[PDB]
């Protein structure tokens, strides 16, 4: 018998021929130079996730000199060759420490599971040995790396079991352990990140104990137990969500529960805050707390910190917030990428995290419903004029509030286009009186929408009108900020692409084998294959068509009417 598997050509045959052409006999290595070096350098400037051809790989193989010269030509040349036999691995690993140190941004490309090489992980760990504050923001992807950290772990597990066979029960991982033991806050972040991975991977549960053993100082462990009581607090919230009663009755019961919880908050000592690791919480105001009317039955409570100031917080249980949490972290990272351009889009980086497997917490904000703002306030103008009314003596213009509102609008549009976040509706969109445009429910993304697939821009008819009357100024300004954000993003987009590659490689909610096509789609919305920025202008033209249909065909007009009906 035989097996046909995955009237056609195949992959392994091309491997056969290509590998047959891989001789490279006379070992003398020339050091020639010519005008083609620039073109080759441009060929090495391609995106990390790309799959190079044959001739290009060989051209990069003879480029070893310049490949060592350019720091951006390192990872590309590393992926330009396949290491199986010790022959190639010899010169490879020999040139690993020989070549110039690569940029840490480009180091995230070779830090993925795509390259499992021991020397690669080693050298990368040596390059990642320096841990900045951005490593704490990279902890989200470090959890993905931790999920992908296991390859042929039977040997390591047996090695640990060898030393665990004595007393009864009662690698970059060492670098992560040292970084965890170094700063208590980073350790708390690692533990909190392990709390989520504990559900998916059973090994993470014991890895948390290994992390507790990784940190010698027990000073952080006490506050970690005080923060471990938050699990019992979430269990109490779930206990409050166990019984079914009237809306007002459940509200008063939530008040009594808030008092009983206020007793414990004063009883127990101060702990680490969910919003920031630096800030410490003191107590919570019982009468200042609120309750969500949604189906998730979220809890909103204002807790007075050690800084003697009230802090509103909204938490939820019985669901996985990892989607919107990772999306929030991505929004914060992107916000940092924008701050690196010395320009602020005035986007509010809402804090979101997952406490338990079903449980999660988020920093509350002054958010109002879009439908509520439409019905009650009768337009966004009055609502924006509610907090800080501005009537100019000339044009009746509005200040940095409206400016930040517009910047937040354009920024949210660019984010919605790029990331392709779906399930965004009038309900999923909120308005922040601080002058910010809030967006929630990131669970569906990467080209996944509840209804039929719409355009990239999330801009509705209302904002299109508000910016439509002001278009002569506001649309040109929003387009300027658009293009600027496009250049800024697409400039550094590589690192985010690699990070997203590793993160998606680990695992994802709402996406599974999406991942390949998802990476692809990210590249397409990014249009990395095009050196022309006219795509943004086309999107602007689409935004221009959002107000009025071009009516090229009857089905086109029906399509515009469909998009209008969907909103």
């Amino acid at each position, epitope marked *: 018998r035989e097996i046909m598997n995955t009237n056609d050509p195949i992959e392994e045959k091309y491997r056969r021929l290509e590998r047959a052409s891989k001789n490279a006999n006379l070992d003398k290595q020339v050091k020639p130079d010519i005008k083609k070096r620039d073109y080759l350098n441009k060929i090495i400037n391609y995106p990390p996730g790309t799959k190079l051809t044959a001739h290009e790989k060989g051209s990069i193989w003879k480029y070893r000199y310049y490949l060592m010269n350019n720091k951006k030509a390192l990872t590309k040349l590393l992926q330009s060759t396949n290491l199986r036999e010790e022959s190639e691995r010899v010169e490879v690993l020999e040139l690993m420490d020989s070549w*110039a140190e690569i940029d*840490i941004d480009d180091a995230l490309e070779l830090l993925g599971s795509t390259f499992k090489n021991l020397s690669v992980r080693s050298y990368a760990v040596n390059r990642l040995k320096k841990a*900045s*504050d*951005k490593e704490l923001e990279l902890y989200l992807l470090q959890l993905v790396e931790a999920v992908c950290f296991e390859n042929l772990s039977t040997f390591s597990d047996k090695s640990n079991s060898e030393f665990t066979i004595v007393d009864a029960v009662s690698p970059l991982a060492e670098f992560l352990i040292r970084r965890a033991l*170094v700063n208590p806050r980073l350790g708390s972040f690692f533990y909190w990140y392990l709390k989520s991975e504990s559900e998916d991977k059973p090994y993470l549960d014991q890895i948390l104990s290994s992390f507790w053993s990784r940190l010698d100082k027990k000073s952080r462990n006490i506050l970690n137990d005080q923060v471990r009581l938050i699990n019992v607090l979430r269990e109490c919230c779930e206990t409050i969500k166990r019984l079914k009663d009237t809306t007002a009755k459940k509200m008063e019961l939530l008040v009594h529960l808030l008092e009983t919880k206020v007793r414990p908050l004063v009883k127990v000592r101060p702990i680490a805050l969910p919003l920031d690791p630096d800030v410490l919480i003191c107590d919570v105001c019982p009468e200042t707390s609120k309750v969500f009317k949604s189906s998730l039955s979220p809890l909103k409570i204002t807790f007075k910190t050690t800084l003697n100031q009230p802090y509103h917080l909204m938490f939820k249980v019985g669901d996985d917030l990892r989607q919107d949490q990772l999306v929030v972290q991505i929004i914060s990272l992107m916000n940092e*990428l924008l701050k690196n351009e010395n320009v602020d889009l005035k986007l509010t980086p809402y804090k979101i995290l997952a406490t338990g497997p079903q449980e999660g917490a988020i920093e509350f904000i002054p958010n109002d419903t879009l439908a509520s703002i439409l019905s009650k306030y009768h337009g966004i103008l009055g609502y924006l004029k509610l907090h800080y009314p501005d009537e100019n003596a000339t044009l009746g213009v509005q200040g940095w509030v409206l400016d930040n509102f517009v910047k937040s609008c354009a920024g949210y549009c660019v984010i919605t286009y790029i990331l392709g976040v779906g399930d965004r509706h009038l309900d999923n969109l909120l308005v922040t009186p601080d002058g910010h445009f809030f967006h929630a429910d990131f669970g569906y993304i990467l080209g996944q929408d509840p209804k039929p697939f719409p355009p990239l821009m999330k801009l509705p008819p209302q904002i299109i009108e508000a910016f439509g009357g002001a278009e002569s100024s506001n649309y040109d300004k929003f387009r300027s900020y658009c293009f600027v954000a496009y250049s800024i993003l697409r400039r*550094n987009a590589g690192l985010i692409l690699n990070l997203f590659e590793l993160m998606k490689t680990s695992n994802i909610p709402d996406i599974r084998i999406d991942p390949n096509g998802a990476i692809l789609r990210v590249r397409e919305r990014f249009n990395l294959n095009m050196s022309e920025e006219d795509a943004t202008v086309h999107f602007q033209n689409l935004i221009n068509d959002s107000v009025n249909a071009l009516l090229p065909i009857v089905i086109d007009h029906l399509h515009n009417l469909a998009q209008y009906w969907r909103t």
Partner: nanobody
Amino acid sequence: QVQLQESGGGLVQPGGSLRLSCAPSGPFSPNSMGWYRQAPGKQRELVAVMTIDGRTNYQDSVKGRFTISRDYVKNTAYLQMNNLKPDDTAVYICNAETRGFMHWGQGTQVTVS
């Protein structure tokens, strides 16, 4: 580029020791981070430059005096100097090049009697 906070402002006698520090806020993993000094009615020149490779370079006059080590813990740059002189009293600033885009956080006044 990124937004950084660095204050070297102060006054001291000649031969003293004044420590300078720069704490960046923004995207990390900068291509290079360095510090320089300049006076009014004059031009600014390269003083201390610390690359991302761990290598550092200093000027001719401040050689052996002004040295800059990069602390990777908080991702903060530390420039320590000694034996300041009369002509060494001026306004100092710290610049950090990131991905080809230069970033100047701030500057401060240094006075020497």
